[PDB]
Design a protein around this ligand. Structure first.
Ligand code: U4J
Ligand code: CL
Length: 242
């Protein structure tokens, strides 16, 4: 049911890094990873938390739809794409933390906690600031737990409306061509050690879906592109994508 393929470790060592890739073959109900223990190691989700955060905001009506404009608050931040108006699609695309912090404040601690328990999300612990716990609070989630959560989202089995789940899956759209569709979300955790990068989502094929969750050590922002590049090298090696 789970199989460990250490040959994938080469994809991390080539960049003098360390990490895990977890793949789940939905048709076969079989999982594959280079490191079974790290596959189950729990980290801060960082911006991968925008997936459940989006679902909750939509289902509570904090966000009406994917077109509602959230105006820039006028504070110039170090990420240029953050200093502009956004909707849910672009807020996800550019991982706009301040927009989602406003979501979290409107959701509030009580409803946020209830919804994460309902989602069985990670350790379900939101200790810390209601608008930063996923960056520097007590919430933790592993790669296999990310896949478990994503499988529910894909099948519309989370305890929010179908509409909310469809909109979030629209917002997760990352790449699409004649060969595959990727719906995914990046994360970059820097506020508490160890600094890591995330990429979680799935690859839609004609007759199967491959769910994936990867994280890797990320001492500097220079390596952020490796989150997707390493995942794609594994998918290519396993003949999942050309
Ligand atoms: C060194 O600090 C930072 C802080 C934030 C980012 C960032 C901001 C928005 C999107 C992404 C990204 O995943 O593409 C990364 C980078 C570096
Ligand atoms: Cl879509």
């Amino acid at each position: 049911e789970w199989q460990e393929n250490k040959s994938w470790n080469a994809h991390f060592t080539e960049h003098k890094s360390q990490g895990v890739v977890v793949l789940w073959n939905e048709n076969k109900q079989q999982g594959f990873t280079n490191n079974l223990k790290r596959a189950n190691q729990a980290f801060l989700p960082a911006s991968t938390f925008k997936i459940p955060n989006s679902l909750i905001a939509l289902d509570l009506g904090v966000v009406k739809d994917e077109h509602q404009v959230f105006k820039w608050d006028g504070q110039t931040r170090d990420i240029a794409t953050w200093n502009r108006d956004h909707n849910l699609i672009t807020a996800m695309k550019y991982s706009v933390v301040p927009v989602y912090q406003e979501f979290a404040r409107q959701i509030g601690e009580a409803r946020m906690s209830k919804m994460l328990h309902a989602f069985d999300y990670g350790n379900e612990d939101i200790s810390g600031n209601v608008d930063s716990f996923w960056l520097d609070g007590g919430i933790r989630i592993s790669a296999t737990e990310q896949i478990s959560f994503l499988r529910k989202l894909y099948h519309n089995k989370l305890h929010v409306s179908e509409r909310s789940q469809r909109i979030v899956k629209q917002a997760m759209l990352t790449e699409a061509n004649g060969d595959y569709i990727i719906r995914a979300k990046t994360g970059y955790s820097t506020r508490i050690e160890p600094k890591i990068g995330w990429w979680v989502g799935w690859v839609e094929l004609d007759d199967n879906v491959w769910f994936f969750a990867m994280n890797m050590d990320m001492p500097t922002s220079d390596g952020l592109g490796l989150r997707q590049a390493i995942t794609k090298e594994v998918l290519k090696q396993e003949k999942i994508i050309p």
